[model samples]
Structures are given as C-alpha cells and as structure tokens.
Target chain A: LLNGIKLGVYIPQEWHDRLMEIAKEKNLTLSDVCRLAIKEYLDNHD
Target chain B: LNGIKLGVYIPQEWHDRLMEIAKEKNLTLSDVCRLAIKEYLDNHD
Candidate 1:
C-alpha cells in the first residue's frame, strides 16, 4: 500500500534467478520475497 | 522506513507476473516488493 517509503536495490544475476525460482515455488512475488528477507534480516540483526 | 512514495521501472512481463502473484496472495504490489527485499537480505546477511 502507498503507506510506506519506497526504495530500490540491485542484486547479482544469480541471486535474482534464485529469488525468482523461490518466488515461483512459494507462490509469491519477487517483492514479497524481498520484503520477507528484509524483515528476517532486521529481526535477527536487531 | 518512513512513509514516502517511490517508483521503479520494470519490464511488462515481470510486472504482470508480480501482479498475478500479488493477487493470488492477496497482497499489494508494494507489499510483495518489500517482502522480496526482506527475504533476499535476510538470506544473504
């Protein structure tokens, strides 16, 4: 939703491919995968 | 993140695929994108 900040990031081709594959397997969008990854990262780091 | 607006240009096919997945998951496009970034970063670091 248009309720949060927007950001853009770049990643390696291999990583992108893996992400796409995972998204397909999980029935999720690339964006969703990215968000979950970020959330997990923050949760662990913080 | 703070509240703000942002945009990015992506291929039509990718956008379409994302839209499809988002709809299936009952999530907004932004929500999908955020989840994706989060998932990626969490795996790497």
Candidate 2:
C-alpha cells in the first residue's frame, strides 16, 4: 500500500461520507479514489 | 508514496455515489474518478 501519489484534495463532506460508505462496500479508500481519479484525468486529458 | 499526486473533481449527487461504488469493490476514489473521467473523455465528447 501507499506506493503511489497521495495527492491532497478538498472533497466536500458529502463526497467523503459517500466515498467511505461505498468504500466499505467496495473495499477502497479515500485517497485511492483520488489516485484513480487523477490517473484518468491525466490519461484522458493527455 | 512512490509517485506524484493529482487533484480530481467529482460531480455532485449520483456522480459521487458511483465513485464510492467504484471504491467499495476494492477500488480507489482516484481509481473510480479516473475510470469516470476516462469514460467521459473516451466517448462523451
């Protein structure tokens, strides 16, 4: 774990709540989401 | 911390929820976020 970028993002509280809740169901984490999000963003943009 | 960091923008309402779905199944917010934006950019133009 903790092998990639740990970018700090300012997600809304609502976003955080839902993210974690779903994380429980999906087995993921907050930053993990941010990491993939960033990956796609760059992959798509570039 | 082995790579760089990036900031992603999640949409409101269901949009964010879907992100959670992406994560709950052994995914990451960024992972979901990337999947989403990738989906968008890949086809939705």
Candidate 3:
C-alpha cells in the first residue's frame, strides 16, 4: 500500500502508457508526472 | 510500474487528502491520480 519512500498504486495499462508518453514529452519520469498531477489536484481542490 | 505497482514517492502530507479522495470516490489511488492527470492535461496545453 504505502511506505516511507513510495506509494504504489496499480494503474490501468493505458494510463501507464499515457503517463509515460506524457513524461517523455516533458522530459520527466513517471513519478514526476504523477506528482504534478496530484499537485494540480491539490491546488484546485484542497 | 505499468498496469500495476506504480510505486512513486509522494509527499507524506499528501497521503491523507489523496486517500480521502480515493476512499470517498470509491476509486483506487491510481484512479484518482488518473483523474488528476486528466485535470492537469485539460487545464493546460
């Protein structure tokens, strides 16, 4: 579930591909993509 | 880490609110994140 270092979430295959594709476009890692996604969500909602 | 095991480092402080959304919306953390990604992309170029 969770650890001090990482949070492992099982994503859909397509979503994974999507993340990778986006990451490549932006020159970021999958983790970076997800982190920014979360950041944006928090900024708007929390 | 695709289709499973998207083990990524997130802010520890972010977990609570992230979990709250996941729980309240009956979505897995990944699902919530995908939605967040959607929001991110749609809000930008």
Candidate 4:
C-alpha cells in the first residue's frame, strides 16, 4: 500500500515544461518523476 | 506504507553530476540511486 502526503510547488514554466516532456519520454507520470527526484535527493544526502 | 525519510546536503558540483548521470541513464535521480544501492549490496555481500 502507498501512503504519502501531497506536495505542491511553483516553478518556472520552462522547467515545468521540460520536466513534463522528460516524464513523457520515460513512460512515467509527472508525480512519479517528482517522487523519484525527491527520493534520489534524500538518499544521496543521507 | 510508512517509511523512513532522510535528508542530505551535497555540493553543487556533485548535484550537477548526479543530474547529468540521471539524464544519461534516462532515469529519474531516485531510480539511479535505487539501482546504485542494489548494486552496492549485491557486489559487497
């Protein structure tokens, strides 16, 4: 089961568009990419 | 499921390198780390 809270952020349009395009090419939803980004960030730091 | 959360601080250059590797692999940074962790464990043990 998945349990998590939602996060919202405001980013520049160009970055948002690029991320969306990247997500599409990777066959992942935007949320999936965001989650992966966060996870990757934390793992490296810790 | 509930899980542990971690926080890390990294140098700007290292972060940039991570982004580069992620792009090269066509993977999210998290996927890259996931694979790295698994590989580390598999190789070490």
Candidate 5:
C-alpha cells in the first residue's frame, strides 16, 4: 500500500530559494517566513 | 433540547434587511454582519 504525500505545497523554485535564503539570513525557518509574509499582507491590506 | 438566542442592535430596517439576506443565503447572522461590516469599513476607509 502506497501511502502518498497527503499534504503538499508547491512554489516556484526561484521563489522557494529566495524564501529559504531570506529565512536563513533572518534566522527564521520556512514557517516563520510564511508567517511574516501573511502578517505583513494582512496588516497592509486587511 | 432548548437552544440559544443572541441579539445585536442596529437600525431596525437595516437589521431586517441583513437578517433577510442572511436567511436567504443560509448564513449565520453574525457571520453576515461581520462580513458586511468589514466590507463596508474596508470600502469606506
């Protein structure tokens, strides 16, 4: 029985690399990068 | 079993219209009110 990858997220390779670099530069994980992006978006537009 | 009732106040006509739309859309009044208020606030401000 092949239990597949249930949760998947796709992003462009360049964007993913940029995010990883930013996270590393800022001492943040990928989840932290996502959180910061979402918070900034909501703060500006919501 | 008994249920619960919650009430909020606005102008009566506006409240009735909002409630009507909420019922027609099968949405909760609170959710509709929140969406309408947030939409209107965002639109105006």
Candidate 6:
C-alpha cells in the first residue's frame, strides 16, 4: 500500500515537464524525481 | 585552494525535494546540502 499523506505543490510548467520527463526516464517515483533534482541543485549551489 | 561563498535562491519546490531526500537518507537537510555541494565541487573542479 502507498504511504504518506497528500501535499500540494506549485511549480512552473517547464519545471513540471522536466521533472516528469526525468521521472519517466529514470523509472523513479515522483518523490524520487523531485529528490534527485533538489539534491543536484543544492549540490551545485550550496 | 581558495574559499568562496555565494548566495542563490532556489524555488520552494526544490526545497521540498531536498527535505524528502534528507528524510529518506536520514541526514539533516543542512548536512545534506553541504555534502551535495562538496560532491559537486569535486566533480567539477
């Protein structure tokens, strides 16, 4: 069974497309897709 | 070696993603960010 509660998020269309594409390409759950992007972004910026 | 620091703003969605990774990896979000930065720097320079 799926776990975790629902949450609302807002992102630009471009970002949403990019995330969805990456998720499909990598066979990742949406959460993983988001996680990877954040990790990559923080790694570059922080 | 030289030390440099810069500020940048990432969107809120990105922050959410980072929190998710922090929980999954059992790392403090700040620590995760620091490690991520070090890893990126190693890859780039």
- After superposition, candidate 1 runs with Cα above 4 Å error: B1-45
Look at candidate 2 and tell me the lDDT of residue B36: 55
Task: Give per-residue CA lDDT, model 5, range B1-45, as digits (tens).
Answer: 022222222334444555676687797555554444334334423
- What's the TM-score of every candidate structure? 0.49, 0.40, 0.71, 0.47, 0.40, 0.42
Judge candidate 2 at residue B8 and give its lDDT: 35
Which residue pairs does candidate 3 place in steric collision?
none
- Which prediction has the highest TM-score against the true structure? 3
Instruction: Point out the worst 10-residue segment of candidate 1 chain B by lDDT.
Output: B1-10
Superposed model 2: Cα runs more than 4 Å off: A1-6, B1-45
Provide per-model DockQ scores. 0.10, 0.09, 0.52, 0.04, 0.02, 0.06
Q: What share of the true interface contacts does candidate 3 keep?
A: 0.65
Q: State the fnat of model 2.
A: 0.12
DockQ order, best first, reads 3, 1, 2, 6, 4, 5
| Candidate 4 structure quality by residue, lDDT tens digits, B1-45 | 123222334345545555677897797654554454344334334
- Model 3 per-residue lDDT tens digits across residues B1-45: 255567788887677778788899898776787678767766556
Which ten contiguous residues of candidate 6 chain A have the minimum total lDDT? A1-10
State the lDDT of candidate 5 residue by residue for A1-46, as single tens digits: 1221121234345445555666786798744554344334233433
- Backbone clash total, candidate 5: 0
Per-residue CA lDDT of model 4 for A1-46, tens digit only, reads 1423333344345445555665787797755655555455546655
State each candidate's clash count.
25, 18, 0, 1, 0, 0
**Which residue pairs does candidate 4 place in steric collision?**
A45-B8
Query: lDDT score, residue B37, model 4?
Result: 38
> Candidate 2's residue-wise lDDT over B1-45, tens digit each?
123343533334334465556666687655655455345334423
Model 6: lDDT of residue B12: 66
Classify candidate 1 by CAPRI docking class: incorrect
Which candidate gets the maximum lDDT versus the true structure? 3
